[PDB]
Coordinates of C-alpha atoms and ligand atoms in Angstrom, one line a residue:
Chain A
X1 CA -14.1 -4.5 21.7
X2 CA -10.5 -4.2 21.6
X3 CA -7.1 -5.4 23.1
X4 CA -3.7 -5.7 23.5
X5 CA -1.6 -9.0 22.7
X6 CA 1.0 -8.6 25.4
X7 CA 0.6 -12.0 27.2
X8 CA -1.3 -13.9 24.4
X9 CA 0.3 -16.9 22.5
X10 CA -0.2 -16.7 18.5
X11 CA 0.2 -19.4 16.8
X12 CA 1.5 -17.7 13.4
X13 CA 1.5 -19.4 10.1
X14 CA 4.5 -18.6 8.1
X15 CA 4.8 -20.4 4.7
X16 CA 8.2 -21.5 3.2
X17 CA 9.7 -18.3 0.0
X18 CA 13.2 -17.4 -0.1
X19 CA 14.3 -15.2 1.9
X20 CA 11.1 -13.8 3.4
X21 CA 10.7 -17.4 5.3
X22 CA 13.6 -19.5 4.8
X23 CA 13.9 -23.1 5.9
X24 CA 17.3 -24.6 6.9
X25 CA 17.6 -28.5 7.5
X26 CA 20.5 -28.9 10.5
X27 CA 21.9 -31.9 12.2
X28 CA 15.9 -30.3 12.9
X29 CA 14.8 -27.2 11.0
X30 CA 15.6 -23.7 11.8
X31 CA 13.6 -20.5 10.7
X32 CA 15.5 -17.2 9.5
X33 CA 14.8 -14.5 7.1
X34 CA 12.7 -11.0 6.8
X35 CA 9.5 -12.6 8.2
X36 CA 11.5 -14.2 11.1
X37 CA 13.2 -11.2 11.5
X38 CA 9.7 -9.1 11.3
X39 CA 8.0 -11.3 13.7
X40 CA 10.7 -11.2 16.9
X41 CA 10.6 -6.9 16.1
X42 CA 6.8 -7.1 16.8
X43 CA 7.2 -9.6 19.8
X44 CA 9.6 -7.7 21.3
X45 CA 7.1 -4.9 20.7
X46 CA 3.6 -6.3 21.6
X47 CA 5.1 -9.1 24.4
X48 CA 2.8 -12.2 22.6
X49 CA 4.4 -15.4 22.6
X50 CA 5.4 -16.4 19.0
X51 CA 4.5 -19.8 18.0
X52 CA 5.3 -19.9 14.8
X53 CA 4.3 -22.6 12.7
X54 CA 5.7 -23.4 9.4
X55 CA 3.2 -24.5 6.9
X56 CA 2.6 -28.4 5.5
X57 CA 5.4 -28.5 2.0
X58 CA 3.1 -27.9 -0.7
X59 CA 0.8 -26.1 1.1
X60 CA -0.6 -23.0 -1.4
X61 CA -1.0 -19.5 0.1
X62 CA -4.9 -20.0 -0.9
X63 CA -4.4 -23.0 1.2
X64 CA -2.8 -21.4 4.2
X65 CA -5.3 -18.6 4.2
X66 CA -8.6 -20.8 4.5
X67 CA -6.3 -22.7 7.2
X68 CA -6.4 -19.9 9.4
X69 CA -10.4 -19.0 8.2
X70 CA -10.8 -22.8 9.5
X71 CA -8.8 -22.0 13.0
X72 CA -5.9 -23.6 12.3
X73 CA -3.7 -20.8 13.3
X74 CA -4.1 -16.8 15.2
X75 CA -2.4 -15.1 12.6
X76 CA -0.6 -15.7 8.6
X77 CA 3.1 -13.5 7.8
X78 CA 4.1 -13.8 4.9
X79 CA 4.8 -12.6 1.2
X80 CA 0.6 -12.9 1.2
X81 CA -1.0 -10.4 -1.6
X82 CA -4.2 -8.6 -0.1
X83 CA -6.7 -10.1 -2.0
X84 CA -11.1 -9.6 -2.7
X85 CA -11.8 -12.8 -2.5
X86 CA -9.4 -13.5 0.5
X87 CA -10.8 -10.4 2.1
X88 CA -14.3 -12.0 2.3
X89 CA -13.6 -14.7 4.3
X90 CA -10.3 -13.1 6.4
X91 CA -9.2 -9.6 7.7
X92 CA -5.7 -8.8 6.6
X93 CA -3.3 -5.6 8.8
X94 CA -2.3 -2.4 7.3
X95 CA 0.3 -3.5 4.4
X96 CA 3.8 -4.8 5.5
X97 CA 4.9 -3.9 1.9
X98 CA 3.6 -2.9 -2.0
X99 CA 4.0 -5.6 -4.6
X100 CA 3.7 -6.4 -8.1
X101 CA 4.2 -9.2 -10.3
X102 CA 6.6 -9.8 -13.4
X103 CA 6.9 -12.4 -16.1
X104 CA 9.4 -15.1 -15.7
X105 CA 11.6 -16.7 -18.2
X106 CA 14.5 -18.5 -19.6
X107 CA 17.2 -16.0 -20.9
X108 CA 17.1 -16.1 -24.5
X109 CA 13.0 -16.7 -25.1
X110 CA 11.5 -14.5 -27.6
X111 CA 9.2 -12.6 -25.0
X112 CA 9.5 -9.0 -24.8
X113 CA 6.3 -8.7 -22.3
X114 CA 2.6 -9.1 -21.3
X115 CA 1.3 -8.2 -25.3
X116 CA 2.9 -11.7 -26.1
X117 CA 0.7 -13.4 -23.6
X118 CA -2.5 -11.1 -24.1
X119 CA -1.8 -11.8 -28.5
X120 CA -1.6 -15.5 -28.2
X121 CA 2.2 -15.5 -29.2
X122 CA 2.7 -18.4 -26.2
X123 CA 0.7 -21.4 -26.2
X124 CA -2.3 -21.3 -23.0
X125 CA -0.3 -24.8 -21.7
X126 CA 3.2 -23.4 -21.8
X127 CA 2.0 -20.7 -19.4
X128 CA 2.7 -21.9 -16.1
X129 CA 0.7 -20.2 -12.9
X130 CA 1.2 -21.3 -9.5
X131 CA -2.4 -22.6 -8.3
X132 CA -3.6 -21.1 -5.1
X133 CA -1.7 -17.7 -5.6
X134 CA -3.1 -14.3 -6.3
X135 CA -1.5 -14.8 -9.8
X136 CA -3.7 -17.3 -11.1
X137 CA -6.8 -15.5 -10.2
X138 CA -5.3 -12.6 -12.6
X139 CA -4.5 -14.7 -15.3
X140 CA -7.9 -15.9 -14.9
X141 CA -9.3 -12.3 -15.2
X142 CA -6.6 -10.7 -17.7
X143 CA -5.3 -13.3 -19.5
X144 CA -7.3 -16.0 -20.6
X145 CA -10.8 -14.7 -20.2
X146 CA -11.6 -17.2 -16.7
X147 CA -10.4 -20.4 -18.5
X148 CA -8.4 -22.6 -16.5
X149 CA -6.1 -23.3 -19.5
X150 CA -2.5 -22.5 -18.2
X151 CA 0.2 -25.2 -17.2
X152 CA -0.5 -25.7 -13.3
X153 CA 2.2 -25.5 -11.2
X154 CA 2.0 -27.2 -7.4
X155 CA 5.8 -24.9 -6.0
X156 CA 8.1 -22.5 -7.1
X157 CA 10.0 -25.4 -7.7
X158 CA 8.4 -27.0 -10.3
X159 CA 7.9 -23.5 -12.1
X160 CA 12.1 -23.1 -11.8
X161 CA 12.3 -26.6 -13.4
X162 CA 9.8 -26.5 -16.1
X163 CA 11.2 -23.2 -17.3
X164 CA 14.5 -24.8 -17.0
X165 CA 13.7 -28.0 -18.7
X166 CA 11.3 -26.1 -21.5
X167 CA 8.0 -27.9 -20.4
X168 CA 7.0 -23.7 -20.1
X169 CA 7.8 -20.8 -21.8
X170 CA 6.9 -18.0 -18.8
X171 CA 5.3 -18.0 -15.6
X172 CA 4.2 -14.6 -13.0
X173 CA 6.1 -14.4 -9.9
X174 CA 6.0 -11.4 -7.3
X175 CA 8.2 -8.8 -8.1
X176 CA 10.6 -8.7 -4.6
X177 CA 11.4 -12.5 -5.0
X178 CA 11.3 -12.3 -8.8
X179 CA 14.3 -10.0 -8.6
X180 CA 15.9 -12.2 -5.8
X181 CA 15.8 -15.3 -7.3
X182 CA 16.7 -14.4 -10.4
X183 CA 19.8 -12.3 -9.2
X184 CA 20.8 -15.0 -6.8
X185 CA 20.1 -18.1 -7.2
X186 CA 18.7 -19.1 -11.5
X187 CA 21.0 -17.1 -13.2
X188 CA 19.8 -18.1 -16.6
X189 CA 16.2 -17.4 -15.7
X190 CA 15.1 -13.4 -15.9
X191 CA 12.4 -11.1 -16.0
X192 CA 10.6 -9.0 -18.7
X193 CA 8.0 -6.6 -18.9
X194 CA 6.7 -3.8 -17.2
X195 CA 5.2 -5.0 -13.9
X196 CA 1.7 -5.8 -13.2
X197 CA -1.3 -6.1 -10.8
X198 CA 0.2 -3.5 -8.4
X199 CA -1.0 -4.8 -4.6
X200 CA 0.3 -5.5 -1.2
X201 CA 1.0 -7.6 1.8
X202 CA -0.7 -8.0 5.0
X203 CA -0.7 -9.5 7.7
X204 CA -3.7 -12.2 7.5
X205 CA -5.9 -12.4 10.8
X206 CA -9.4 -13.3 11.9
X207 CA -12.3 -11.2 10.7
X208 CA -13.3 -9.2 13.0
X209 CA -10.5 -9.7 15.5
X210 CA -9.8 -8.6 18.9
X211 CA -6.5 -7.4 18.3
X212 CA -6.5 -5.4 15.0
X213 CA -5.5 -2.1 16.3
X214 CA -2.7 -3.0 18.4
X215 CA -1.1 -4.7 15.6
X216 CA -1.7 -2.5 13.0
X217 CA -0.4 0.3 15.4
X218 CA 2.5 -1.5 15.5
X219 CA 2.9 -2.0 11.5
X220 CA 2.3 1.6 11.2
X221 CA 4.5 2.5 13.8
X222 CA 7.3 -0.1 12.2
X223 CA 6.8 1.4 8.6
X224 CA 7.3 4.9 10.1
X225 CA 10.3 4.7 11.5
X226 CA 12.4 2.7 8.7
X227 CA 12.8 -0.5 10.4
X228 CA 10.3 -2.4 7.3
X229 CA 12.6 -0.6 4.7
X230 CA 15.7 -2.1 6.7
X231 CA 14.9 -5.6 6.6
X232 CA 14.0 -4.7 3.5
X233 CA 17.3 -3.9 2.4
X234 CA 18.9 -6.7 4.8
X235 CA 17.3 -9.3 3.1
X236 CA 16.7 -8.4 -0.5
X237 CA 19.8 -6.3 -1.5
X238 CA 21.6 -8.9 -2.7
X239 CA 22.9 -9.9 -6.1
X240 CA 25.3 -13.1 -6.6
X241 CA 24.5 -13.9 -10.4
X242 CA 27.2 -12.1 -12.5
Chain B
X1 CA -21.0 -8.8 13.2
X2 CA -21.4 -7.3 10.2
X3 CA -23.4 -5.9 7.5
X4 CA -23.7 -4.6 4.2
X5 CA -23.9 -1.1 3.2
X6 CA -26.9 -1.9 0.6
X7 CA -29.6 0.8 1.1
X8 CA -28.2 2.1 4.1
X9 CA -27.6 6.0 4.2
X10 CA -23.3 6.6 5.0
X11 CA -22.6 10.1 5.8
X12 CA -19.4 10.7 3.5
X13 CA -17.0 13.5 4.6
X14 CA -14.6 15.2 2.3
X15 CA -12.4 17.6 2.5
X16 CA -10.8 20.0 -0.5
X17 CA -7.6 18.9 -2.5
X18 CA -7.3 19.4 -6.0
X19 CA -8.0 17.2 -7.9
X20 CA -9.3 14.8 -5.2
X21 CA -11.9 17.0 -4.4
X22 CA -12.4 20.2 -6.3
X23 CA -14.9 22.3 -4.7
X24 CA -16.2 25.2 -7.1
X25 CA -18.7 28.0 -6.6
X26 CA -21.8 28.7 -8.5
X27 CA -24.9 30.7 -4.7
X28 CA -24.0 26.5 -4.6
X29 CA -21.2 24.4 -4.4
X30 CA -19.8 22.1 -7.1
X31 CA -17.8 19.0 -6.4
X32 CA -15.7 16.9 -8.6
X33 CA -12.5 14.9 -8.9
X34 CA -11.1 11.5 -7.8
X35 CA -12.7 11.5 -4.5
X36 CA -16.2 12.1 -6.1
X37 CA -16.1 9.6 -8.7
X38 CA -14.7 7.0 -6.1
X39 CA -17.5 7.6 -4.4
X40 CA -20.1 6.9 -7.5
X41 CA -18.2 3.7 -8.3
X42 CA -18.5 2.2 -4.7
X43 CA -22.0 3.8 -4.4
X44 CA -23.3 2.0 -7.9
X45 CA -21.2 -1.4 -6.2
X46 CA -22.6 -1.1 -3.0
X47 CA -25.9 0.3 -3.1
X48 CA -25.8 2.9 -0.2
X49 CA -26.8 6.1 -0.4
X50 CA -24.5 8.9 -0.5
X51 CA -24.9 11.7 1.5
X52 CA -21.8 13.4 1.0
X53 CA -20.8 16.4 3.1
X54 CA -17.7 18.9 2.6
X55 CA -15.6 19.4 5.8
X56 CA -15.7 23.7 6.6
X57 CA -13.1 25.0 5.4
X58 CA -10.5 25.1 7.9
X59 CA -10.7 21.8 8.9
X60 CA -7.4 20.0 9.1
X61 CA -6.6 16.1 8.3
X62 CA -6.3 15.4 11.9
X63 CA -9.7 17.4 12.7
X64 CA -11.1 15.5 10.1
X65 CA -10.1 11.9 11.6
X66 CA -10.7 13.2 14.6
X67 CA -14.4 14.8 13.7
X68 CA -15.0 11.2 12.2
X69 CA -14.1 9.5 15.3
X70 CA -16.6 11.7 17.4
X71 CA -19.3 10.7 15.0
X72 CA -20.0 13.6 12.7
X73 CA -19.5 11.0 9.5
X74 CA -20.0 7.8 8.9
X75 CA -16.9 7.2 6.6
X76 CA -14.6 10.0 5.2
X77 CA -12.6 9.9 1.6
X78 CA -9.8 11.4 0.8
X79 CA -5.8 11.8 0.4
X80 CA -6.1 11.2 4.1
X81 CA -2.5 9.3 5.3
X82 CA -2.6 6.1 7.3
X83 CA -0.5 6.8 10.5
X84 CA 0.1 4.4 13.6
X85 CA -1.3 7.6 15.8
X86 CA -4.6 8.0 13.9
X87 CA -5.3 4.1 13.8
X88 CA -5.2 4.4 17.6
X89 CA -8.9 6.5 17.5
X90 CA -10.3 5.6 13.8
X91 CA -10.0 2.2 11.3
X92 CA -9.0 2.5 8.0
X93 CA -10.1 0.4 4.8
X94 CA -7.5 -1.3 2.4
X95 CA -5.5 1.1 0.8
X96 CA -6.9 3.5 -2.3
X97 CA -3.1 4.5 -3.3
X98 CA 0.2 4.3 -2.3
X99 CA 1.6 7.9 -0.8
X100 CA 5.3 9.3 -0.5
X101 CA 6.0 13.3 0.0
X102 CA 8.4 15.5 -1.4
X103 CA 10.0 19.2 -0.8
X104 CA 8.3 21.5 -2.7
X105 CA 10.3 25.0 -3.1
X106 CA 10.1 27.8 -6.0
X107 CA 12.5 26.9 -8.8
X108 CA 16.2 28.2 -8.3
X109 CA 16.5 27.4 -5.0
X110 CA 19.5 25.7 -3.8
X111 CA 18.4 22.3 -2.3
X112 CA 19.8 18.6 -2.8
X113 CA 17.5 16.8 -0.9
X114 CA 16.4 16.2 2.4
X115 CA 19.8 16.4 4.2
X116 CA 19.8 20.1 3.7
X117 CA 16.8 20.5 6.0
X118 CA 18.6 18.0 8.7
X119 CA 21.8 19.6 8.4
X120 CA 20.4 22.9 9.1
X121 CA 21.2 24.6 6.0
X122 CA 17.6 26.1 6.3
X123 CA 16.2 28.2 9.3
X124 CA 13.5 26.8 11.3
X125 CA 11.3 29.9 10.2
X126 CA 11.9 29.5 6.7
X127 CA 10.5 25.7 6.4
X128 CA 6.6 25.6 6.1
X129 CA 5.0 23.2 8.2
X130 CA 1.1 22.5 7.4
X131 CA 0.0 21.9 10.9
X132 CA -2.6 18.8 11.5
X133 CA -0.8 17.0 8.5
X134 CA 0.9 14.0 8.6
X135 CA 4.2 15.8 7.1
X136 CA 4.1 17.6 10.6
X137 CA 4.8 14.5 12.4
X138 CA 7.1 13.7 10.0
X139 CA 9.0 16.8 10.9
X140 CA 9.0 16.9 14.3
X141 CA 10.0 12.7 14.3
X142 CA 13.3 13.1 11.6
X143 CA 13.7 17.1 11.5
X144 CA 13.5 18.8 15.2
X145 CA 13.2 16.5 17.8
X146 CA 9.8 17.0 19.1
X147 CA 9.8 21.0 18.4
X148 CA 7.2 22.7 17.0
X149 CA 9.9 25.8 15.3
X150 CA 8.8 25.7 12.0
X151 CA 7.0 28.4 10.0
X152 CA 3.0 27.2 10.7
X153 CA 1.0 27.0 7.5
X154 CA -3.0 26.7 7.7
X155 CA -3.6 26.3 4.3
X156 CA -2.0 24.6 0.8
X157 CA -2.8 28.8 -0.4
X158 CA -1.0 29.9 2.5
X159 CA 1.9 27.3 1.2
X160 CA 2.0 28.4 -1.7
X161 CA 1.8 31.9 -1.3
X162 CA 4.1 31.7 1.6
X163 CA 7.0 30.1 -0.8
X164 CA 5.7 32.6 -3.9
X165 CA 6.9 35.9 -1.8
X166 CA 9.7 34.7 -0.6
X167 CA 8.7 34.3 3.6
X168 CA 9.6 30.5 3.6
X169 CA 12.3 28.3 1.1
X170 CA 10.4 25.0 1.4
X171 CA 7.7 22.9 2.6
X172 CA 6.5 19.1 2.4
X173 CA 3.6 17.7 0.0
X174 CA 2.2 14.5 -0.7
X175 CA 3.7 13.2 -4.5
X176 CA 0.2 13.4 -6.4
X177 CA -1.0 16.5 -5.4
X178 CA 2.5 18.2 -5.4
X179 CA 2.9 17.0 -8.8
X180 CA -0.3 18.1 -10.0
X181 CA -0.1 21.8 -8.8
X182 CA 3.6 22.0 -9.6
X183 CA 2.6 20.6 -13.3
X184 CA -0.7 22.9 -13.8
X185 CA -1.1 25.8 -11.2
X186 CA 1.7 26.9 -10.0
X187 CA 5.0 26.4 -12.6
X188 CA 7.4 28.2 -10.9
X189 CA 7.4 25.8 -8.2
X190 CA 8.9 22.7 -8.1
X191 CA 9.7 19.3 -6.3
X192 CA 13.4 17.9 -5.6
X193 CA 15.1 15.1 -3.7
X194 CA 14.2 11.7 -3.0
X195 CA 10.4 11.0 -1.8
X196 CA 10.1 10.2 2.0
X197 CA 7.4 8.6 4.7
X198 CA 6.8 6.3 2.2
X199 CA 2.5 5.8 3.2
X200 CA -0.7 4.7 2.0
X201 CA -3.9 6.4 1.8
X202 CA -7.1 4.8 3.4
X203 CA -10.6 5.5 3.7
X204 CA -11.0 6.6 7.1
X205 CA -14.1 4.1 8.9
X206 CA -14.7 3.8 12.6
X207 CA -13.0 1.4 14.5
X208 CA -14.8 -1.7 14.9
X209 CA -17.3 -1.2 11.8
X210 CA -19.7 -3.1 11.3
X211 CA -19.3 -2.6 7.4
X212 CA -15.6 -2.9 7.1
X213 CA -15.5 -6.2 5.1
X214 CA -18.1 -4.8 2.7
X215 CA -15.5 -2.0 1.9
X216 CA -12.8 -3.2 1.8
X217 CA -14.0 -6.3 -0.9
X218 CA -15.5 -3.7 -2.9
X219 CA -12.4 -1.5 -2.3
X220 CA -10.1 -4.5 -3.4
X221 CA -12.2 -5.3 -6.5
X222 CA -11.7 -2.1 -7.8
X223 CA -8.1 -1.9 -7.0
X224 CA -7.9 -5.4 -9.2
X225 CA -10.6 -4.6 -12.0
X226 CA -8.0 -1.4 -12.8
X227 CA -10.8 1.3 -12.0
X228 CA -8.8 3.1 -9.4
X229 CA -5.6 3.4 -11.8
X230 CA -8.3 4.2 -14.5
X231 CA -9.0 7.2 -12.1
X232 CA -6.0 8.5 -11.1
X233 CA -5.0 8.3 -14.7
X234 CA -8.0 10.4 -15.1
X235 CA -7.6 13.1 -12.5
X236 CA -3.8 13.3 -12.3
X237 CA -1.8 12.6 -15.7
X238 CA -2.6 16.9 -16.8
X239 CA 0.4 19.1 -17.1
X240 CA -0.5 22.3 -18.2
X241 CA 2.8 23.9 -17.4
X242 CA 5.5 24.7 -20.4
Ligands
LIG1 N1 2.0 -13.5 -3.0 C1 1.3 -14.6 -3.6 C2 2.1 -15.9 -3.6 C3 3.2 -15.9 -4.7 O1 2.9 -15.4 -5.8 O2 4.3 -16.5 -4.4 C4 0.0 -14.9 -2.9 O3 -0.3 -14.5 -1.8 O4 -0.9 -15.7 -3.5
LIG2 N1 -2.2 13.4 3.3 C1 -2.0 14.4 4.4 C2 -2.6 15.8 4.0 C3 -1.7 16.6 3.1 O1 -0.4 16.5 3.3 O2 -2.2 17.4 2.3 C4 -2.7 14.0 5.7 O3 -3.5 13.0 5.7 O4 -2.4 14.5 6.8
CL3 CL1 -2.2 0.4 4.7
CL4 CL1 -13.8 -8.2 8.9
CL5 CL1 -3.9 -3.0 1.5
CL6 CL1 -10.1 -1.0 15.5

């Protein structure tokens, strides 16, 4: 059957990426950005009680799915790409937002987009991929014919400093915090390309779970009437780099 | 639980859009398009059998969800919108394409966008409404406040028709079939202003299937393996018009 969540405490994973979840350290840690932002519109909505629980540093967003698979927490928000193989094993909501990836570099490499990669212009270990994203299991499929042969990367952190330090020559990143990174915060990285692996972001839930239509009424109803496309703008329409 | 759809018998409805479904006579009917071949590609996936069934004529979208709901399919395909009110009574799979509408009006008119039809420039009478399509919703959330004062359409024909001799200025249709009949049928009408109700098609399943993991994997994998941009490619990229 069915229900609604008004009086139910989720605990809801959300997993550390600028400036859909962004973590401050105070003098303790406080919480803001679009998924904050997202999550306080559906609990003024639905009347849960939001637990939100930010995800162990490191932590991939493979690794945070099969967390909640294993009952480690009600529901995922996030910047989390709809995926098969995540599909099996977890039910996501109607899509919070499209996506698509681009390729990452340093200003001034001699990439001009995915042919370079695909034509063996770039060295297989000077492509970085972020393990435990939906990236890697593209470049996997696309790229290098299912050998594990890129440059792993463990954070986005490590892919902004090997790019900046030369230890890689490109790396994938999703397109909304591709733009806003590299307008806001590593001017001298950019992006090239046309985009790739069109897809989307859902809400990541139990299989099977009691509450699906009340919260993908709510997405729906949130889409509908602008206020996803709002925080859109709020948090993304932004540009610091010169 | 669940289950999967291997050997299992799924009555499929569909319901006429060119060129998602093109429905052809000779007495029998023909079927082709998007839709159909979708269908053959999760049928040779899956290992259901098809028994596909065209909705009468005048069904509407809503009758359709709503005809679904009361059990006369098992799963219906189509350029069928995800909205919050029809995920109240039916489920819907992962997405098979994004969806955005535009005005369509004959070429000449005098129309900037959207803000025309809000400011009035336009009597009631004179914009076409399709009724039991998401665009009516649409109209009666952003354009009239809750009234039903537009010029009723039943049919795309009557659309069309309706805007040929003159009786209404404009009306609202999804991007991919408006771009397709203003590109190939019709070529003295035409789209302008920016796209709105940003959506998402879905395949319309009962809520609480027992098969909706096995559809929406199979769903995913083709959205990832490039089949479904392989057939909208296929269907959509005509343009007949000079
Ligand atoms: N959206 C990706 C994460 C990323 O690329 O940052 C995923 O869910 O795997
Ligand atoms: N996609 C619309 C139908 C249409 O506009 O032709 C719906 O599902 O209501
Ligand atoms: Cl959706
Ligand atoms: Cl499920
Ligand atoms: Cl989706
Ligand atoms: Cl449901």
């Amino acid at each position: 059957g069915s229900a609604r969540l008004k009086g139910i405490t989720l605990r809801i994973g959300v997993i550390e990426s600028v400036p859909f979840t962004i973590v401050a350290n105070v003098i303790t840690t406080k919480l803001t950005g679009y998924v904050l932002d997202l999550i306080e519109y559906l609990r003024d909505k639905m009347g849960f009680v939001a637990d939100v629980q930010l995800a162990p540093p490191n932590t991939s967003y493979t690794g945070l799915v099969l967390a909640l698979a294993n009952g480690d927490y009600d529901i995922a928000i996030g910047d989390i790409t709809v995926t098969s193989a995540r599909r099996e094993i977890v039910a996501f909501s109607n899509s919070i937002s499209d996506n698509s990836m681009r390729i990452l570099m340093r200003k001034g490499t001699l990439i001009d987009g995915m042919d370079d990669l695909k034509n063996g212009k770039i060295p297989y270990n000077r492509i970085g991929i972020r393990i435990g994203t939906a990236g890697e299991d593209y470049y996997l499929r696309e790229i290098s014919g299912g050998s594990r042969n890129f440059y792993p990367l463990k954070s986005r952190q490590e892919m902004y400093d090997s790019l900046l330090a030369g230890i890689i020559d490109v790396s994938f990143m999703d397109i909304g915090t591709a733009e806003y990174v590299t307008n806001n915060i590593y001017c001298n990285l950019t992006l090239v390309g046309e985009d790739f692996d069109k897809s989307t972001f859902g809400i990541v839930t139990p299989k099977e779970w009691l509450y699906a239509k009340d919260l993908d009424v709510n997405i729906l109803s949130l889409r509908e009437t602008g206020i996803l496309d709002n925080l859109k703008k709020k948090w993304f329409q932004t540009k610091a780099c010169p």
